[PDB]
Amino acid sequence: PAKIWCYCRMVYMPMSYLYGKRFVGPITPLILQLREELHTQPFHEIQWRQTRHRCAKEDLYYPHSLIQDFIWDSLYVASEPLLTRWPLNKIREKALAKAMEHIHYEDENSRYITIGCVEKALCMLCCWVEDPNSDYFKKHLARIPDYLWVAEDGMKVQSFGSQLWDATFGFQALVASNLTEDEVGPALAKAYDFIKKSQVKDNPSGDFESMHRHISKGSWTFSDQDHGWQLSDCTAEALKCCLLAATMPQEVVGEKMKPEWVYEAINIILSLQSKSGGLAGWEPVRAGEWMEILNPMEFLENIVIEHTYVECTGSSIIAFVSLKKLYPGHRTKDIDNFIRNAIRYLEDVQYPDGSWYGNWGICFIYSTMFALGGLAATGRTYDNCQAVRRGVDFILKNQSDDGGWGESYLSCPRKVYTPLDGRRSNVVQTAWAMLGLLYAGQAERDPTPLHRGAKVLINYQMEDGGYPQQEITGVFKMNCMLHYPIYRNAFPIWALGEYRKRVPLPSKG
Amino acid sequence: MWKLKVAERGNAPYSEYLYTTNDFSGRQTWEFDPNAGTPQELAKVEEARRKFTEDRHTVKPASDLLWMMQFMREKNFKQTIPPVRLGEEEQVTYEDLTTALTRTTNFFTALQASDGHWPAENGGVSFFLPPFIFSLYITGHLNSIITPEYRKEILRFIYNHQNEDGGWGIHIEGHSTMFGTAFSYVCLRILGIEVDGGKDNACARARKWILDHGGITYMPSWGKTWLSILGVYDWYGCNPMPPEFWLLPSYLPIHPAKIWCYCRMVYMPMSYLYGKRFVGPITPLILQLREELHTQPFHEIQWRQTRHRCAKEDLYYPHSLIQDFIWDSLYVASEPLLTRWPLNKIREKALAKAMEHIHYEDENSRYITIGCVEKALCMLCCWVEDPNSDYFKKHLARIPDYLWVAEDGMKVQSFGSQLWDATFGFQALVASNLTEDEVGPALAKAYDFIKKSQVKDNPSGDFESMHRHISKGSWTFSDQDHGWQLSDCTAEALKCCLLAATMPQEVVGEKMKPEWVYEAINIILSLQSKSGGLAGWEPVRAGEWMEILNPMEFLENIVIEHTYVECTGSSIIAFVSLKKLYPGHRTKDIDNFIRNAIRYLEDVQYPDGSWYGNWGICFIYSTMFALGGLAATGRTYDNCQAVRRGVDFILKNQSDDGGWGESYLSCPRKVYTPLDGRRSNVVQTAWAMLGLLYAGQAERDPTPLHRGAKVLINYQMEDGGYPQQEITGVFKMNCMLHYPIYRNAFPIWALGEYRKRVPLPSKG
Ligand SMILES: CCCCCCCCO[C@@H]1O[C@H](CO)[C@@H](O)[C@H](O)[C@H]1O
Ligand SMILES: CCCCCCCCO[C@@H]1O[C@H](CO)[C@@H](O)[C@H](O)[C@H]1O
Numbered sequence A: 001p002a003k004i005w006c007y008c009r010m011v012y013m014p015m016s017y018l019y020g021k022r023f024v025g026p027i028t029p030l031i032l033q034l035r036e037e038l039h040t041q042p043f044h045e046i047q048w049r050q051t052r053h054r055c056a057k058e059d060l061y062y063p064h065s066l067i068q069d070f071i072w073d074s075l076y077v078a079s080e081p082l083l084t085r086w087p088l089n090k091i092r093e094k095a096l097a098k099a100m101e102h103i104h105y106e107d108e109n110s111r112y113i114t115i116g117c118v119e120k121a122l123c124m125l126c127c128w129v130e131d132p133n134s135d136y137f138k139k140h141l142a143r144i145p146d147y148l149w150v151a152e153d154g155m156k157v158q159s160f161g162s163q164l165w166d167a168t169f170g171f172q173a174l175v176a177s178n179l180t181e182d183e184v185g186p187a188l189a190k191a192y193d194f195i196k197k198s199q200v201k202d203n204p205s206g207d208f209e210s211m212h213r214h215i216s217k218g219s220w221t222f223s224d225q226d227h228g229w230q231l232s233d234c235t236a237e238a239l240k241c242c243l244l245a246a247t248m249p250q251e252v253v254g255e256k257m258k259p260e261w262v263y264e265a266i267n268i269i270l271s272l273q274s275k276s277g278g279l280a281g282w283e284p285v286r287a288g289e290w291m292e293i294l295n296p297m298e299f300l301e302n303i304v305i306e307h308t309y310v311e312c313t314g315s316s317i318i319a320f321v322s323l324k325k326l327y328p329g330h331r332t333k334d335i336d337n338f339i340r341n342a343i344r345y346l347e348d349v350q351y352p353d354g355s356w357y358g359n360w361g362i363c364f365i366y367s368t369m370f371a372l373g374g375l376a377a378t379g380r381t382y383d384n385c386q387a388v389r390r391g392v393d394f395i396l397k398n399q400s401d402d403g404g405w406g407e408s409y410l411s412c413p414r415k416v417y418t419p420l421d422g423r424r425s426n427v428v429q430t431a432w433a434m435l436g437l438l439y440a441g442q443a444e445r446d447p448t449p450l451h452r453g454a455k456v457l458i459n460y461q462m463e464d465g466g467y468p469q470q471e472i473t474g475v476f477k478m479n480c481m482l483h484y485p486i487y488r489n490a491f492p493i494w495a496l497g498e499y500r501k502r503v504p505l506p507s508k509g
Numbered sequence B: 001m002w003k004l005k006v007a008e009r010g011n012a013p014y015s016e017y018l019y020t021t022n023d024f025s026g027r028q029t030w031e032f033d034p035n036a037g038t039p040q041e042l043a044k045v046e047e048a049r050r051k052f053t054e055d056r057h058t059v060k061p062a063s064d065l066l067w068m069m070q071f072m073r074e075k076n077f078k079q080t081i082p083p084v085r086l087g088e089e090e091q092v093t094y095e096d097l098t099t100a101l102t103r104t105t106n107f108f109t110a111l112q113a114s115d116g117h118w119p120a121e122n123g124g125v126s127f128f129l130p131p132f133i134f135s136l137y138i139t140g141h142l143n144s145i146i147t148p149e150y151r152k153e154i155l156r157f158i159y160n161h162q163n164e165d166g167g168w169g170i171h172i173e174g175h176s177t178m179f180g181t182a183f184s185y186v187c188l189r190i191l192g193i194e195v196d197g198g199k200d201n202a203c204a205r206a207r208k209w210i211l212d213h214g215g216i217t218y219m220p221s222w223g224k225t226w227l228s229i230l231g232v233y234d235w236y237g238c239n240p241m242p243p244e245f246w247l248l249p250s251y252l253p254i255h256p257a258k259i260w261c262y263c264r265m266v267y268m269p270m271s272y273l274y275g276k277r278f279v280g281p282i283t284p285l286i287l288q289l290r291e292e293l294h295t296q297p298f299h300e301i302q303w304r305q306t307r308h309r310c311a312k313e314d315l316y317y318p319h320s321l322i323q324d325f326i327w328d329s330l331y332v333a334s335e336p337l338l339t340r341w342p343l344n345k346i347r348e349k350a351l352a353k354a355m356e357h358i359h360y361e362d363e364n365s366r367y368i369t370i371g372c373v374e375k376a377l378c379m380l381c382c383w384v385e386d387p388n389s390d391y392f393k394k395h396l397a398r399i400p401d402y403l404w405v406a407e408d409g410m411k412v413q414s415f416g417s418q419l420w421d422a423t424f425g426f427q428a429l430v431a432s433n434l435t436e437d438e439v440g441p442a443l444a445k446a447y448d449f450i451k452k453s454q455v456k457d458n459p460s461g462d463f464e465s466m467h468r469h470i471s472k473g474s475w476t477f478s479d480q481d482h483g484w485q486l487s488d489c490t491a492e493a494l495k496c497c498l499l500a501a502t503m504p505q506e507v508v509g510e511k512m513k514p515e516w517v518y519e520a521i522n523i524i525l526s527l528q529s530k531s532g533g534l535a536g537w538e539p540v541r542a543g544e545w546m547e548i549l550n551p552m553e554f555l556e557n558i559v560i561e562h563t564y565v566e567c568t569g570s571s572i573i574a575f576v577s578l579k580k581l582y583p584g585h586r587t588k589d590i591d592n593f594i595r596n597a598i599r600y601l602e603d604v605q606y607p608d609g610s611w612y613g614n615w616g617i618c619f620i621y622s623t624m625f626a627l628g629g630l631a632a633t634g635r636t637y638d639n640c641q642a643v644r645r646g647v648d649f650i651l652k653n654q655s656d657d658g659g660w661g662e663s664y665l666s667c668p669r670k671v672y673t674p675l676d677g678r679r680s681n682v683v684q685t686a687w688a689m690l691g692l693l694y695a696g697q698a699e700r701d702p703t704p705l706h707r708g709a710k711v712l713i714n715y716q717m718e719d720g721g722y723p724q725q726e727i728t729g730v731f732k733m734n735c736m737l738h739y740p741i742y743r744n745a746f747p748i749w750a751l752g753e754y755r756k757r758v759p760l761p762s763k764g
Helices: A006-021 A029-038 A066-079 A089-109 A117-130 A136-142 A163-176 A185-197 A232-246 A261-271 A289-294 A310-326 A332-348 A366-378 A388-397 A427-438 A448-458 A487-502 B043-055 B065-074 B094-111 B129-139 B148-160 B179-190 B203-211 B221-229 B261-276 B284-293 B321-334 B344-364 B372-385 B391-397 B418-431 B440-452 B487-501 B516-526 B544-549 B565-581 B587-603 B621-633 B643-652 B682-693 B703-713 B742-757
Strands: B002-006 B028-032
Touching: A006 A089, A006 A117, A066 A289, A089 A117, A089 A136, A117 A136, A163 A185, A163 A232, A163 A487, A185 A232, A232 A261, A232 A310, A261 A310, A289 B544, A310 A332, A310 A366, A332 A366, A366 A388, A366 A427, A388 A427, A427 A448, A427 A487, A448 A487, B002 B065, B043 B065, B043 B148, B065 B094, B094 B418, B094 B742, B129 B179, B129 B221, B129 B372, B148 B179, B179 B203, B179 B221, B179 B284, B221 B261, B261 B344, B261 B372, B321 B544, B344 B372, B344 B391, B372 B391, B418 B440, B418 B487, B418 B742, B440 B487, B487 B516, B487 B565, B516 B565, B565 B587, B565 B621, B587 B621, B621 B643, B621 B682, B643 B682, B682 B703, B682 B742, B703 B742
Parallel strands: none
Antiparallel strands: B002 B028
8 A cells, every 4th residue: 555646545445445344325215216217227137247347438548458357357256255255354354444543544634624525525424434423524524615616607516725826826927027016015925924824844643654654844735734745846836936035125025934944845855756857746656657557447547656747847946946046055966966867857758749748737838838947947058959949849830820829628638739729729828838938048039929929918808807718728637627717817927027028129109 | 620511411411311491591511621631721720719819808709710711712812902091181082982892892792602692690698508518418419419629619619708807798798797607617517627727727717706606596597497407406496487377268468479489489498397397317527516616515505595686797677576476476386286296187288288389389490499598498308208209319410500610619609690691781782883793693693592582381280379470471580491580681681672673684683573572561561569660570469567577687678579660660661662663562551551650760769869779789770770761751851850860969979080889888778888999890880871871961061971981991901801890789688799791791881872872073
């Protein structure tokens, strides 16, 4: 269990307990009258041993391997005839007790706001079937209304919080944009104090070490401080925000953080790193890529084991480069080595077409922006450099009739980069492309394409404010999708803030 | 008193009469004449021996000079042309290049053209000869087969290349290995030579290196398995390899029809030997030699916990945790069961199936099976079953087909390479301009041999559904007597045939029928992967996760095959060349295959602008083939994807005079270290020039090409050829190979197209 991914470990463990207990819910009169219409054959007059392997051709993304199917088939006859009529009392009871105590130790440290709606829902049943009358069940029931949400359509369910990530992105956009009226100072302070208060500093309760978990010291979460989960992606943006706000005057933004807490964040970031370059999100490395053969699901990919993410590597390298300007005072001979290790990783992930796709945003250029931002930091030029011109040429070759950029939700799963969505464009994707191209120093090279890129943004501006474009603009594990409501405004303002700073574009009137 | 002569002895050559397929089409044999002698020519042998003995440190390999010496009397050309030398950036004209070609081509084509090819050699690594010595010692025919005059030659071969530090190498240019050192010491000691401490008899020197490395328990699994048969090691100290893997309905994920052919044909005799638990007789030499080797008493040590002790010098691919756990579980699953209470039915059926599979395989292979080690092990496998038979005698009869002699002592040739080198030489000759036009008879005398070298008959018996692939009009790497499909040689053979097809009939002779090429095209199209490219023997079996079960630790990617870039480039250039002659077979399929293969080449490219190969030791060896296969589909240079990367990589890396060089350790480390003293080699420079030429850089900027051509004329010998001696070959990223004719085949090929591409006008 100390080898598999954290999400799979915390999801399948309640599944393991439920399978071991063979728990079946009460058969209400609705169940008996509804179980007949679903199945095309009679409910109890069918077979089940040979019906286990029937995969649909519509929901099949990663088919099972021969070895995996053979292992499951062997285990079916190894376990069911044994641990159902003559169950090993000692082994099964110890396994159930260990699962129960692990779930109890995990939920207490997670403050009952555990990762995933499905995982929390399954854990609620797992703890209810053990003791319907307790306090853990009541506290789990109390945090249920923390996930429901309302929109233009009916009520929906929010998988997890994202206030910290969007707040950091908005703060970075605001500070990058020129303070014209300078009245954003109070809002910047009222967000900075919240950001400071959002830092997770306490260790998980109990013996977190040697319990299939990693050490957390001054780390950041993705949802809120109440969770207490280390994630290198959000920490890299938080450190950049803190460093950029550090140089701002004290009299305008307020007090500043102590310079000793950043060392813990640097140590945590350096803790997560692979042997060939880059870093993962939660754990550095467990095993090889051959562990994915045992994937139970068929509509996802790369779930059992983690992998290195290019966006996190780019954010970490740009954060480390930004730190050098302020003060070099911690492991001068180690940060340079880490940067050298990370530099060669970015070149490997590049595809021959000149672009490499990400893992969270639905685009072949979403990770390109972060890579270009993290590549120009180490002095990578454009006239004479390796792999820098490939992304620029890829971006230039692919545009709309008016210079816009667009893709489709099926582009990433097929890994083909199909932009045929009607030759349309979106504000978020165009802003991402412009920001990525800006880090390459193309403003002084040839800003003529940038003129239409900026002009295709002003028309989409609403008189009431904001941009009315509505798209998911997010992917999850190459099959699932995600939506962000503030990306419509956060990124265009960020791009327009640096558009004037890079190229003055003089015009008296 | 050694004369090199074609065999022509199909009726009882040494001990048993054998059967040929095309009247000994290229059979290689060597005989020690009893009455040969010359007052002055025989004196050259001592000079050849002493030159290598004194320049072993500076030059590790040795080109075959005594072999080509014998052909100087048979063809007394006596040509006198000084080596043309140009300096101070003087532009060369057609005259100097034509003179150099006239001097370096006539003797090359007169070296050997009677049969239709040139005798080539592999790379002497001193790795598979101790198996032959052990086999001959265990069969009792060592005295009958190995004459005493061969003993001094093999002793000199062993002594000529020995590391002064004590630790030998896996290949000729190795450094501080345990397998090679131990095997060489055992083979030298078992042939009746005592223990001394001199420079010639360096047993005492090797004692210090053997003893200070934890005995002989740090050698790889092959060494332990081999010494367990000779009464030196114990079966409990190695890993279990049950012979029951061949009993399955071929539905399990691991079946013999899934693993590579070489591994399947090598480990099967190992499986039989492990199942039978056969141990050779303990001669008085064995008991007196088993004590000095081990640092502890022979029988007073443990073996169950000594199975996992890997040396830090001969470790390239460490074992995985799952593999070690599987072996540990199998050790207690099989040994307590199938040793004291063996399953009679299962074990007997497994042994019978292994025996019948070996017998069916050797008959179809004409007893010239792949690999010296595999043949040596199969000889023991068939001898322990029936010491008095005909298969054993016929195996014993083909033993002298592998021994070879060079400037150093007698060596062993792993496999034949006459067809590959003959095709390369023919391609070079036809690409070079026919100045005197007298190469026509030699071209015909090689073309008829090439036509006769085609394998057309199916393997005897039910070759299909026997873990083998269909062969129809295929080509082998060694000779037609083998009958093994290989897409690499077929691609070059088809190009040679197509290029010779457009030549006039009156000058080269008759031509092949246009119906046989369809079978070759079908065979080539049969081998292809689902993502692009193709393998050598089988299209695809499983994924890349099968390599976790690798038993060896000094190699990599042995259990399963892989796609080779060089073969893909050769196939695509052959297919493009075929379109010019006549499109008449699957017009909608060849284009699809080319489209599939095009995208494969882009993927294998490294970010540095170059991708290394698998057979030549260079990061640019595969680059030449890729560039040759990429410019065929209209890939330009000014505006194209990935074409400029290789050109920039080649331009950025040069010598002080524009030369190119690498090191044997560059490919294993995948770093492309050229720091060999900033030197260069003729073969590598010719490869680089040929690869750059396909990119159309002759009209772009031929200024770098001037020095690239000039650094070649100086290396030209007045007697002909180039004296540079390097292996210029790699095998599975750890082993090395040598080619003796690459010194001449490639420079002439480059010079032939140098004048054709850029005229370089100069009136005088
Ligand atoms: C200490 C040794 C106890 C011997 C078996 C106890 C009697 C049966 O006990 C049961 O046996 C079944 C099959 O083994 C399983 O259900 C469990 O082992 C156990 O509950
Ligand atoms: C149908 C079962 C017959 C007996 C199987 C015993 C377990 C297999 O084991 C083998 O069986 C041989 C034949 O009995 C015996 O020589 C030994 O028990 C053992 O070698």
